[PDB]
Nucleic acid binder design. Structure first.
Lengths: 422, 266
RNA sequence: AGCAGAGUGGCGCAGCGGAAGCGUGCUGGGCCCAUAACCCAGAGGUCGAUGGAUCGAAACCAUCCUCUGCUACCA
């Protein structure tokens, strides 16, 4: 299954497929294939098995040696050991977030259900690069600090440039946790020092305490392509949710409720929403059958919903509770909030632009990323430490946790501040 | 031999010819819309406009539609004209030309076995069989092909008048080989947008009831093209008997799914 | 994968139940003192496979495969 969710976030032009296939062995893929204008801009999924030969390096199935195929310029070979079967240490899960700035709201959502991260830095561009800081700050807000910085694209980048970049990032982030996070330079054109990464992810990132006894909550981020094959139609025996569970052991045959709900017919107001109920058909993770779905892992829960809800990616950031979950489904919400004194996620080579953003004004639409949900809503009252927001689609608030608040600076929204629900 | 019910053409009738020579004064041509009798076309009555080329108009080895302007009944001079021709007449004549060819090929199997050492053999077969098939249904626009097509799908037509031997197998084979496979363009149009989870089994009960009052063992063609769209090609007759199968079946699927939760497309 | 088209005999488009169909091009001839325009003349040949009726099948009708067009998903 899975034990931890390590995320693979990282700004434009570092190469995703080479690094993702080295760590998991499962390609990051999605709609439009095709391939990728550059690096994956979709929310990729992948799981993997991490075993040892009693060595800090992680074998392949063929554990005698491993000859790469990253480049035919030279032969990159590494040796994990010699063969006689290897001991399974754990089953790991990844969360490949978008690597592009416009997709920030999606990157936030996907990130918010991980248990650790890997900041994929690229040495090609600017030293205190916008997105590195954006990522790091969001991570410390959500409730994580289990980060391993990875210098992923320094294959042709000289050692002065690459040294200056790690220095400037680590010096800018002087107020964000990063001093207890290692910085592992690797090759992505010769897959070198990959074996030492395997030592790091088992060290810096154990399994955090998971609450089995507590009531099941599944947070779905990705829909399912079911169905439409054959034989026997139409619509499906139904619809599969790619979600991570962050609380409770969800057992097979259990009934689960999707709690933001669907709005009642001919509503004259903003109420009333009614949750949808679906019975769990199957609990699939990796490529191995399971009867349980332990928390701390990203699992494909097939449920008895019908094709229309899964025919496109429409279940991004929905909260699912088993069953008749107590969590309130607000339509208008009381945010406590604070703002950054800089505009995060933007800063280029020349002061233009990135400074203090002006105070929020009422009746402006802002993206409130609450939980893994992403709703848009307008601010109806605006006091400094008390704003009232009215949301277009209702938000199930599992706990008052955190929020991330963004404002439409130009073409798309950009992160301005965070806070906590009251 | 003759391809037509009458031996000689009338006056103002649309016919077909095949050019075998090009004359100074027009075109002398053989018929293949009747006997191989001679008919003369004249240069003046071919068009109402100039004529630069001449082999990019009429040339040898071409079927050309034309109107019989005059006929000498006793002499056998079939005067001809291409001046009054419309494309609608060409469609009507090409069909009659093609249909006579296939019908005479059916009435050639008869002559393969019987005494045909003399050319008049086919003429003997043609007059006695063809006329009673087509004359009864010429006034409604049918050829002898209609009579034979009716016989294969209900055999009483060719048993109502003298039935030949060995003919019947080849007759059946050629009717059933060429005029089929044989066909239903019945497709169901069904739209559904469920909030149900019991929809998967609900649809199964609805699918198997596409035709009411049939056995549970009836074979049908289910098709899934998209998630809301359920196409059922219903029991394949001719699409004039499965009309009730198409129309009322659509009501079943849309009704069965509304009972288990929510509103749907009607 | 649902629907559509095709699987050269110079080119390009692919026409129909009679073995190149249309448009074009190339090459040659004719007209003219000459050119254009105009008029004629060409060319080794199941046209992806497996079958049936047939005198015969790119073309009459099927069973298969492949490439593409529109729609669009299993992967």
């Amino acid at each position: 299954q899975a034990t931890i969710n390590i995320g693979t976030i990282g700004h434009v032009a570092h190469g995703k497929s080479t690094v993702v296939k080295a760590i998991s062995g499962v390609h990051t893929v999605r709609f439009k294939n095709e391939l990728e204008r550059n690096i994956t801009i979709k929310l990729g999924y992948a799981n993997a098995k991490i075993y040892k030969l009693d060595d800090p390096s992680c074998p392949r199935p063929e554990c005698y040696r491993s000859c790469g195929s990253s480049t035919p310029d030279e032969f990159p070979t590494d040796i994990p050991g010699t063969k006689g079967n290897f001991k399974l240490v754990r089953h790991v899960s990844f969360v490949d977030c978008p690597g592009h700035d416009i997709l920030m709201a999606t990157m936030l959502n996907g990130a918010a259900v991980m248990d650790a991260a890997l900041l994929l830095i690229a040495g090609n561009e600017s030293c205190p690069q916008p997105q590195t800081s954006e990522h790091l700050a969001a991570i410390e807000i959500m409730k994580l600090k289990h980060i391993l910085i990875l210098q992923n694209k320094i294959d042709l980048v000289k050692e002065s440039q690459a040294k200056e970049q790690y220095e400037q990032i680590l010096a800018f982030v002087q107020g964000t946790v990063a001093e207890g996070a290692p910085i592992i330079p690797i090759s992505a054109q010769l897959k070198y020092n990959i074996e030492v990464v395997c030592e790091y992810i088992v060290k810096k990132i154990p399994v955090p305490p998971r609450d089995f006894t507590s009531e099941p909550r599944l947070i779905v981020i990705r829909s399912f392509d079911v169905n439409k094959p054959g034989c026997e139609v139409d619509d499906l025996k139904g619809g599969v949710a790619g979600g991570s569970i962050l609380k409770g052991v969800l057992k097979v045959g259990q009934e689960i409720e999707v709690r933001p709900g669907i709005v009642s017919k001919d509503s004259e107001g903003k109420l009333m929403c009614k949750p949808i109920f679906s019975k769990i058909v199957s609990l699939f993770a990796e490529h191995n059958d399971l009867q349980y779905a332990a928390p701390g892992g990203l699992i494909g829960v097939g449920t008895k919903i019908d094709p229309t809800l899964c025919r496109a990616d429409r279940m991004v950031g929905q909260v699912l509770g088993a069953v008749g979950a107590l969590p309130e489904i607000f339509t208008e919400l009381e945010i406590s909030y604070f703002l950054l004194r800089r505009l995060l996620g933007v800063r280029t080579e020349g002061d233009k632009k990135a400074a203090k953003v002006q105070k929020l004004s009422k009746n402006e639409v802002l993206m409130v990323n609450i939980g893994s949900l992403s709703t848009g809503g307008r601010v109806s009252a605006v006091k400094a430490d008390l704003g009232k927001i009215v949301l277009t689609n209702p938000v199930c608030t599992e706990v008052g946790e955190k929020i991330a608040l963004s404002r439409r600076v130009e073409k798309h929204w950009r992160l301005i501040g965070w806070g906590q629900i009251r | 031999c003759r391809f037509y019910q009458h031996k000689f053409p009338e006056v103002e009738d649309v016919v077909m010819v095949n050019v075998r020579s090009i004359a100074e004064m027009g075109a002398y041509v053989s018929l293949l819309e009747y006997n191989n009798i001679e008919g003369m076309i004249l240069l003046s009555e071919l068009s109402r406009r100039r004529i630069r080329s001449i082999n990019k108009l009429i040339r040898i080895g071409r079927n050309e539609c034309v109107v019989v302007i005059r006929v000498d009944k006793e002499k056998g001079y079939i005067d001809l004209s291409k001046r009054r021709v419309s494309p609608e007449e060409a469609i009507k004549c090409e069909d009659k030309f093609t249909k006579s060819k296939t019908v005479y090929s059916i009435l050639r199997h008869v002559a393969e076995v019987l005494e045909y050492t003399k050319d008049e053999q086919l003429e003997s077969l043609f007059q006695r069989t063809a006329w009673v098939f087509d004359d009864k249904y010429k006034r409604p626009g049918y050829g002898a092909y209609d009579a034979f097509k009716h016989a294969v799908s209900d055999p009483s037509i060719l048993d109502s008048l003298d039935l030949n031997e060995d003919e019947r197998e080849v007759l059946i084979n050629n009717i059933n080989r060429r005029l089929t496979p044989q066909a239903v363009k019945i497709r169901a149009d069904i739209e559904v947008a469920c909030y149900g989870y019991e929809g998967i089994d609900a649809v199964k009960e609805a699918l198997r009831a596409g035709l009411n009052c049939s056995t549970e063992t009836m074979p049908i063609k289910i098709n899934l093209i998209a998630p809301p769209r359920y196409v059922m090609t219903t029991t394949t007759l001719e699409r004039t008997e499965g009309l009730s199968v198409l129309n009322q079946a659509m009501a079943v699927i849309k009704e069965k799914i509304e009972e288990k939760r929510g509103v749907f497309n009607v």
